[PDB]
Amino acid sequence: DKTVLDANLDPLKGKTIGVIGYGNQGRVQATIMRENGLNVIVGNVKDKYYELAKKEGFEVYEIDEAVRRSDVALLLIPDEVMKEVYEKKIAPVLQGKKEFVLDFASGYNVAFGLIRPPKSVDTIMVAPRMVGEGIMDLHKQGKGYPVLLGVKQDASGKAWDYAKAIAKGIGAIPGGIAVISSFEEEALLDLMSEHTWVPILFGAIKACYDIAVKEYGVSPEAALLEFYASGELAEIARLIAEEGIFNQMVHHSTTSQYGTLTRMFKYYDVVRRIVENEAKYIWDGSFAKEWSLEQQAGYPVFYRLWELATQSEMAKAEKELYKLLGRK
Amino acid sequence: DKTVLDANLDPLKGKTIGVIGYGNQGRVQATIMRENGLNVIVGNVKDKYYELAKKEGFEVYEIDEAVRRSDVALLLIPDEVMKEVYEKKIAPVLQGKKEFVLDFASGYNVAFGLIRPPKSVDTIMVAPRMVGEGIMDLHKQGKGYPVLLGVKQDASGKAWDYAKAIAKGIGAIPGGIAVISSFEEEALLDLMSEHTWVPILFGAIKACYDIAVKEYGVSPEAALLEFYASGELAEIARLIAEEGIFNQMVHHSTTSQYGTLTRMFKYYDVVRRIVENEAKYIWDGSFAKEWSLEQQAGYPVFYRLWELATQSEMAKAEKELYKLLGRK
Amino acid sequence: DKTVLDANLDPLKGKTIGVIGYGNQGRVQATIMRENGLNVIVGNVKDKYYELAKKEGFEVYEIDEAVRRSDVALLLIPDEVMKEVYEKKIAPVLQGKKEFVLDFASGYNVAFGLIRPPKSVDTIMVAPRMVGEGIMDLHKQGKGYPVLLGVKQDASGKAWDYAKAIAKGIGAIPGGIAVISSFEEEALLDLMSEHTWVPILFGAIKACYDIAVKEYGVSPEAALLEFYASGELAEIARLIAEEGIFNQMVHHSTTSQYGTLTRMFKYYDVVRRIVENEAKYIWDGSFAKEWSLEQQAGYPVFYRLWELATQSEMAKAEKELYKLLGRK
Amino acid sequence: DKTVLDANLDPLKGKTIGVIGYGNQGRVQATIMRENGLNVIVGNVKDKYYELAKKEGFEVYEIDEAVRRSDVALLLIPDEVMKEVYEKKIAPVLQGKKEFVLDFASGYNVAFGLIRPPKSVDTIMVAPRMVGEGIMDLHKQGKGYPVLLGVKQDASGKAWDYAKAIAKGIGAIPGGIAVISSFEEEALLDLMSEHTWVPILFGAIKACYDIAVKEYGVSPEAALLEFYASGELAEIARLIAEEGIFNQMVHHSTTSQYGTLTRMFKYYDVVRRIVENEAKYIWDGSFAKEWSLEQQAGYPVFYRLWELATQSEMAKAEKELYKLLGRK
Ligand SMILES: NC(=O)C1=CN([C@@H]2O[C@H](COP(=O)(O)OP(=O)(O)OC[C@H]3O[C@@H](n4cnc5c(N)ncnc54)[C@H](O)[C@@H]3O)[C@@H](O)[C@H]2O)C=CC1
Ligand SMILES: NC(=O)C1=CN([C@@H]2O[C@H](COP(=O)(O)OP(=O)(O)OC[C@H]3O[C@@H](n4cnc5c(N)ncnc54)[C@H](O)[C@@H]3O)[C@@H](O)[C@H]2O)C=CC1
Ligand SMILES: NC(=O)C1=CN([C@@H]2O[C@H](COP(=O)(O)OP(=O)(O)OC[C@H]3O[C@@H](n4cnc5c(N)ncnc54)[C@H](O)[C@@H]3O)[C@@H](O)[C@H]2O)C=CC1
C-alpha cells in the first residue's frame, strides 16, 4: 500500500541542512535531527527565538547566509509572511544555484501558486499532524509519529528518496508511518477540518445554550456545565483516538446510542451539501483570494467577529463561571 | 445567585441511608459517604457487584429489606429497568411508610411521569456531570465537583435541606458548586447534548471522509489521520475546559481563526432550527414514547443501525489502521 | 459463479434431525428427507397437524424433547410466534448444548435481531421460492427446484457444508440450483415484492375500474371482464416464466407492444423513487417496528382495511359476477 | 439620563493642544477654542489651508512637530488618508510618549480596527452633526449645538472628563447637548443614513420621472417641477426640524395626509428588511472591506456610476431647465 514504515538515511549524509525558524516545529525537528547525527544550522530573525536557538547550541547566521551555506532548506515559518520573505531574501540566493532542495510543512502557499520556485530545484513537503509538543512527548519514549509526504518538482529523480530521508531524520519512522500525497490534498484537508465540523460544532453549542435559556427558562450555569464546561468532550475524544469512533459509544447508555445514531443518519444530507460547497470553494482558490484580500485590507472583519464573539452572553457567563471555579 | 458553595450536614446524622446499586456512581458515592461519617447500607441483586460491595465492607441486604431499614434511599440504577423494579419491589414497602425520602441521579423517568410516588414522600435529585471515575480522581486530591439539585415533592419543608445535606455527603462541596433546578431542565439538557451536536459532529466527519475520497481521490489513511485518528480533538477539548472556548483559538493560526469564525456565524441559523425542533420534540414527551415503544418491540432499529455503522467504509479503514498502529 | 448445482450429503449421516411443524413446508421436506435415507423426527403442538404427522409415520415428541434428542433443528413455523416459542421452549434446552445447528426458511426474525441465539451454535437459512405444493408436484417427476442459502454464525467451519447437505436432503439439487446469500437479502426481497409492485398493480386495477365507470359510463361487468375476471393475466405470467418477460410480448399485437414499451420507459422514474423509499424504510427496520407494534395493539388497522376493501364497489360487483358464472 | 448639558473645563488648562487640519471643522473648532482661552497650535501640510491658518494667527509647525509639542491631538482630516498619515508620521512620535490623548470626529477607521494605537493613550471621539458652517452661524448668536461622545481606551480614569472638557471647549454646551456612546454606534448611524433612505429617495424620484414620461406621455419640465425642481422638499425638511415629523403634515391637505399615512403603514415591511440587511452588512465590516478594496483598485465602479448618473435623461433635462431659469 501507499504507506511507508521505514527507509534509508544516506542521501542526507555529507550534506549541510538549513532550518528557517526555531519556534515549535523548527525547534523540535532541529533538536531531533541533530540528535540523529547530521550537520544542521539555523536561520532566523534576531529576536527571542534567535537567543533560544543559540542557547541550545545551534550555530546561526542570517537567513540568506544559511541558504548560501546549505544544500537543503526547511521553511518552518507561518504561511502569511513566507511569501514576502521568499520573494526578497530567498529567490535571489536560490537563482544562484544548481542542485537544491526545499521543504515545507504546509501546502497552502504552493498549491495555489503564491510561490513558484525555479525548475532548478526539487520541491517537497513533509507535514505532521501534531501541534508540536506531543512530538517530543513521544520522542522521549522512543516512538514514532505519522506524517504526509508530497513532491511538486523533480530535477534529480531523488525527490522521494530525500523525502523519506527527512522523514527518518525527524524520528517519525521507524515508530509510526508516512503517507504519500500531494500538496493539494494536504491543504484541502487542513482547511476542510477548519471550515466544516469545528464551526458547526461551536454554532450548535451556542444555539443550544441560547435556546435552553430563552425558551425554557434554564440557568446559564447549568447549560454551560452540561454542554462544555465539563471534560465529557475531552474524554470522548480520547476514547475515540484509542478504541474507535463508534466502538467508543459502547461505554455510554443505550438511550444515548439510540438517539445519536438515529439523528446522525437523519442529518447526514444537510452536512453533506455544506461540505460539498466548501470543498469546491477551496479546490478553486476563492478562499485564498478572500484571505489575501482581507490581509491587504486590514483584518476588519476579523476584528469585528472577535468582538462579537467575546461580547456574547455565553462568553460573559463562561467568564463569571470559570472565575468562580478558580480557573484562570 | 442560585449557586451554592457549602451547607450543613446535620439532617442526615442519626438516620440510616439506603443505596441501590454498587456500579460506578453507587460505589463512589457510598465510599465517600462512609468516609464522611454516616451509617449506610447497600441494596443490590446477587451478582459480581454484590460480591464487590460485600468485599469493600458494605453490609448488604435485599433491596426491599434495605428500604425497610432505611429512612432515605438513593436509586442508582439504569433508567430502563428502574420502572419495573420500583413497581414491584419498592412501591409496596414505600406505601408502608410515613416520612421517607427518595433521590435520583437522573430526571428521565420522573419528569415524564413514568414514576409517580405517593405524596407521603419528599422526592429530589442530585445529578453530577462526571462519568464517575474522575470524581474519585479528584477526591483523592481533596477537591469538590459540581452538581445539579432538584425537588419534586415536599411534605417536610426540609427538602432543600436534605438536598444540600446529600450534596455535602458526597464530597461535591465544599470544593466545587451546586446548582438548583428541576428534573425537567436536567433531562432536557442531558438529551439535547445527545441529540444535537454529537451526532452532527459525527455525521460531518463521516461526510468529509466520504467526499474527500470519492470526489478528490484522497487516501483513507490521510483522511482519518487529519479528521480524528489524531489527538487534536482531545487537546482542543482540554484547552476549552481550561481557558475558554474562544480564547482557546488564540493558540491556533490566524487562517484557522478566520475561517472558523466566518463559517460559524454563517451556519448558525440552520443548527438553531434543528435544535428548536429537537428541544420541542423532547419537551412534549414524543421521544420518551418512541424509546419505550422500541424497547417493547425489541430494538430492531437499534440493531440495524449498529450494523450499518460498523459495516461502513470509514469503520473498516479505521480498523485496518488502528491495527497497523498497534492500538487495540 | 456463486451458483451451486450439487454437493455432498455425508455430514448429515449418523446424526438425528429435528423438524418443527408439519404444515406445508415441514410436511413436504420431512417426507422428502425420510425418502432420502435419514433419521428424522417431528416436534409440534398437539392438534390436527400432530395427528397427520403421526398418521404418516413420523414419530413425534414434544418440541423441547425433539430438540433434546436432535443435533440439528429446522424451525418451520410462522414468523409471528417463533419469537415467544423460542424464548420459552427452546433457548433453555439450547443453552444446554455444545455443538448444534439451527435452520430457518425466512430471515425476518433474525436479520432484525428478534432472535439472537448463542455463539455456541451455527445458524443458517435455506429458503425456497415455491408455496410448497408445486415442490411435490415437481418431486414426483424427479426434478429439482431453486433455493437460497445463508449463514449467520459459524463455530464449526462446517456451516456451508451443512447448508448444501440440507439443500440436497430436500431434493432441491441435483435438478435445480442453490444460491448463496445472507438473511438480509432474503428478507429484503421477500418484502419488496410485497410492498412495491403487487399493491401498485392492485391499486392501478382498482383505479382503472373506478374511472372507466364514473367518468365514461361503462358497465362493471365489462370492466371486470377486461381487467382481471379473465385468465389473460395468468397466461401472461406463464409465458413470462417460460420464455422471458419481453420475448413474451411477441405473441401480442404491435399496438400493444408499442403502447406498453412507450409508457413503461415513460413511467420508470416514479416507481424507482417509490422503490427506493420502501427499500430504505426496510433496510433500517422501521417496518419490523411498525408490524410488531400493530400486533401488540390488536390489528385495528388490519381490521379496518380488510373491511374497507371488501365493502368496495369493485368487490360487490365481483361477487355478483363470480356468482353469475357459477364460480365459488 | 445619558444626556449632558454642561461640565467643567479645568483639565485642559495648563496643557497645549494640537489640531490637525484647518478645513471646515478644524478651522471652526480652533477658532472657537482660541476664543475660549486656550493655547492651541495647528499642524497641516503646506498648502492653501496652511496659508489661511497662518493668516488667522495660528502658529503652525509640521504635523509631527505639533504632536511633539502637544499633549492632546485632534485628528480633523478625511477618513481615507488618516491611515497612512498615522502609520508614517504619528505612530513613532506617539510611541515616544507616556500620557497623551487623541480625539476624532468619526469612528470609521477605529471601530473597524484600521487604527490601533497603543494602550499608553486615552482615545476618544467628539462627533457633531452639522456640516460646519451652521456651527459658526449659531456661535455668533451665542448658542450651543449637539454632539456625540465616545471612549475607546482609558489609561487615566479621566477620559470622560477630557471628553466633556473638549465638548465645552468648542462651544457645543452650554447651549445644546452632548450624548455619550461608542465609536461603533456613530459609524453605524452615519452609514445607515447614507445607505438606506437617501438612495431610496433618489431612486424613487428617478423612477417616478421615468414612468410618468414613458407610460403616460408627460413632459419632463412638469415632472421635474413637481418632484424636486421646487423647494417643497426644503420647506418640508425645515418644518420637520422645527415642529415635528408628523405634526408637520397638519399644514397639508387631508387628502395628502390620508394617502401618505396609508401607503407608509403599507410599505413598512419591505424597507425594514432592506435596513436589516444593510445594518448587518455594516456591523460585520464587509463594507469597509469593499471600500478599501475599491480604493486599491482605482475607483472604476465609482467612475462608471458617476458617468451613468450624469448621462441620464433626467440629468440632461434638469440641465436644460436649470439653465432656462438662470440657475447656475
Ligand atoms: N504549530 C502547528 O500548528 C503546526 C506547524 N505546521 C506549519 O509549519 C510552519 C511553522 O509553524 P509554527 O513554527 O508552529 O509557527 P510559530 O509561531 O512557532 O513560528 C515561529 C517562527 O516564526 C518566525 N517569524 C515570525 N514572524 C516572522 C516574520 N515576520 N518574518 C520572519 N520570520 C518570522 C520566527 O523566526 C519564529 O522562529 C507553518 O506553516 C505551520 O502551519 C504544520 C503542522 C502543525
Ligand atoms: N455513569 C454515568 O454515566 C452517570 C450516572 N448517572 C445516572 O445514575 C444512574 C446509574 O448509572 P450507572 O451506575 O453509571 O450505570 P452502571 O452500569 O454502573 O449500573 C450498575 C448497577 O446496575 C445494577 N443493575 C443492572 N441491571 C440491573 C437489573 N436488571 N436489575 C436490577 N439492577 C440492575 C446493578 O445492581 C449495578 O449495581 C443512571 O441513571 C445514570 O444515568 C448520572 C450522571 C452520569
Ligand atoms: N407455506 C408457504 O407458503 C411458505 C413457507 N415459508 C416459511 O416456512 C415457515 C412455515 O410457513 P407455513 O408452514 O407455510 O405456514 P402455516 O400456517 O401452514 O404453518 C403451519 C405450522 O404452524 C404451527 N403453528 C401455528 N400456530 C402455532 C402456534 N401458536 N404455536 C406453535 N405452533 C404453531 C402449526 O403447528 C403448523 O405446524 C415460515 O417461516 C414461512 O415464512 C417460506 C415460503 C412460503
Ligand SMILES: NC(=O)C1=CN([C@@H]2O[C@H](COP(=O)(O)OP(=O)(O)OC[C@H]3O[C@@H](n4cnc5c(N)ncnc54)[C@H](O)[C@@H]3O)[C@@H](O)[C@H]2O)C=CC1
Ligand atoms: N465636513 C463634514 O462633513 C463633517 C466633518 N466630520 C469628519 O471630520 C473630519 C474632517 O472632515 P473635513 O474637515 O470637513 O474635510 P475637509 O475637506 O474640510 O479637510 C480639509 C483638510 O484636509 C487635509 N488634507 C487633505 N488631504 C490630505 C492629505 N493627503 N494628507 C494630509 N492632509 C490632507 C488638509 O490638510 C485640510 O486641512 C472627517 O473625518 C469628517 O468625516 C464629522 C462631521 C461632519
Ligand SMILES: O=C(O)C1(C(=O)O)CC1
Ligand atoms: O497549520 C494549520 O493550518 C493548522 C491545522 O492543522 O488546522 C494548525 C492550525
Ligand SMILES: O=C(O)C1(C(=O)O)CC1
Ligand atoms: O445519563 C446519560 O444519559 C449520559 C449523559 O450525560 O449524556 C451519561 C450518558
Ligand SMILES: [Mg+2]
Ligand atoms: Mg490548519
Ligand SMILES: [Mg+2]
Ligand atoms: Mg488539522
Ligand SMILES: [Mg+2]
Ligand atoms: Mg451530558
Ligand SMILES: [Mg+2]
Ligand atoms: Mg413474503
Ligand SMILES: [Mg+2]
Ligand atoms: Mg416472494
Ligand SMILES: [Mg+2]
Ligand atoms: Mg449623517
